[PDB]
Design a protein around this ligand. Structure first.
Ligand code: HEM
Ligand SMILES: COc1ccccc1O
Length: 402
């Protein structure tokens, strides 16, 4: 496409460091555009992302690096009967009435435990000391991975992140950094060594762990889902489900710190925490551009005639800065009107864990502000954000008097 020749010079490092300048141009120039270093069409605006995610002429496809990382059948990459079965598999513990039965007793003692380790120090790096541990320990316990330490869960989602977003391709469309998948393979081998004996046990002795229910629910007597059939969805969880609520709470805190009067409002009135998080997710979307759909017939989207078989990456992080919808979207603003956003995606493959994730983030921020009402950002330290596929702050140094 001749007028987009500047896209040939966009690098993967640029998109990882900060994709918003490139995507601001894409939203204006070409809401559906082929990005050479990604080797794919990308949808950058809210209208195009929603249309593709809900269109009957598209179905899910995994990103190239995502497929190399997760294999088949990852819940994000399949359709039809297999997708219906995997949704029925994961949905029970995520049902809102079910989450409401136990979410407080799950997350609140976890939040307290991590807080107790540092709440009197006067300094902390909240990503590693709080946001990521609460996110992974909550979900890990729900899944049946109580004995997998939070350090290890955090290391796994970071390796799976890097592997599944190792998207750069060369002049020939081949992966430019094939090495980059080796740490995803290593994380999967470690996961197998830990989880295979738990599956061995759950097959014979089912319990209330989510993974035991994935093996047993809906199955004929004495049968279980084959472990090779469920492992790719286990990996999907050990990446995003483990990583995202922590990144969402952290981005929300960075946003609030950028608006000190709003931080004070939310600390004074914790009923505003859900609104603060919704704006945080729009402002820096944790799943920024990690999923995709593929056309199943020829289709015209945003003026582009696509053949059947065309993948389109859904860059929901960019769609959530669409200036067709939002005023000054790069600014965090608690008092933005509560409008629809795309940080949980859309359509048949939209996020299955929204209600759970929102409560995990809410309870974590409730307990943080409670414990440390005079929390302030350490302004001697910069907050970098990193990531094109998944995006979040790499640290969040804070301070408080005591
Ligand atoms: C703030 C935290 C989270 C955010 C921002 C988020 C966002 C998303 C997004 C954008 C997608 C892809 C949707 C699409 O392609 O249209 C997704 C898919 C998914 N998410 Fe969430 N997620 C979060 C937490 C979680 C958690 C904690 C769980 C599980 C407990 C979860 C389970 C899933 C599942 C199973 C899918 C795949 C749905 C499918 O393909 O049918 N998510 N999520
Ligand atoms: C819930 O985890 C994911 C969602 C979308 C893409 C990759 C994931 O691991």
């Amino acid at each position: 496409r001749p007028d987009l020749a500047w896209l040939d010079e966009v690098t993967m490092t640029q998109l990882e460091r900060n994709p918003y300048e490139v995507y601001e141009r894409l939203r204006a120039e070409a809401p559906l555009a082929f990005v050479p270093v990604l080797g794919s069409y990308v949808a950058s605006t809210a209208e195009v992302c929603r249309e593709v995610a809900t269109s009957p002429d598209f179905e899910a496809v995994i990103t190239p690096a995502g497929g190399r990382t997760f294999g088949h059948p990852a819940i994000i990459g399949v359709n039809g009967d297999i997708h219906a079965d995997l949704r029925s598999m994961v949905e029970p513990a995520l049902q809102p009435a079910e989450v409401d039965r136990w979410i407080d007793d799950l997350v609140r003692p976890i939040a307290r435990r991590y807080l107790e380790r540092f709440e009197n120090d006067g300094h902390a790096e909240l990503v590693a000391q709080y946001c990521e541990p609460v996110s992974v320990r909550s979900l890990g316990d729900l899944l049946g991975l109580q004995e997998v330490d939070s350090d290890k869960l955090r290391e796994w989602f970071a390796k799976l992140n890097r592997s599944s977003t190792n998207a750069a391709v060369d002049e020939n469309g081949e992966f430019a950094n094939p090495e980059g998948f080796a740490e995803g393979d290593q994380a999967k081998a470690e996961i197998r060594a830990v989880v295979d004996p738990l599956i061995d046990k759950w097959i014979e002795h089912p319990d209330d762990s989510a993974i035991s229910h994935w093996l047993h629910d809906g199955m004929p007597p004495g049968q279980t889902r084959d472990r090779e059939y469920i492992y790719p969805t286990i990996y999907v969880y050990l990446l995003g489900a483990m990583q995202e609520p922590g990144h969402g709470m952290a981005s929300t805190l960075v946003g609030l710190f950028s608006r000190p009067e709003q931080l004070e409002e939310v600390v004074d009135d914790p009923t505003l925490i859900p609104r603060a998080i919704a704006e945080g997710l729009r402002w820096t979307s944790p799943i920024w551009s990690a999923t995709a759909r593929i056309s199943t017939k020829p289709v015209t989207i945003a003026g582009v005639d696509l053949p059947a078989g065309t993948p389109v990456m859904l860059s929901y992080g960019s769609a959530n800065h669409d200036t067709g919808k939002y005023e000054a979207p790069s600014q965090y603003d608690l008092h933005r009107p509560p409008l629809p956003h795309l940080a949980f995606g859309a359509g048949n493959h939209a996020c299955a864990g929204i209600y759970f994730a929102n409560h995990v983030m809410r309870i974590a921020l409730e307990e943080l502000f409670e414990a440390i009402p005079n929390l302030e950002r350490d302004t001697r330290e910069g907050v970098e954000f990193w990531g094109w596929g998944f995006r979040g702050p790499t640290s969040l140094h804070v301070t408080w008097e005591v």
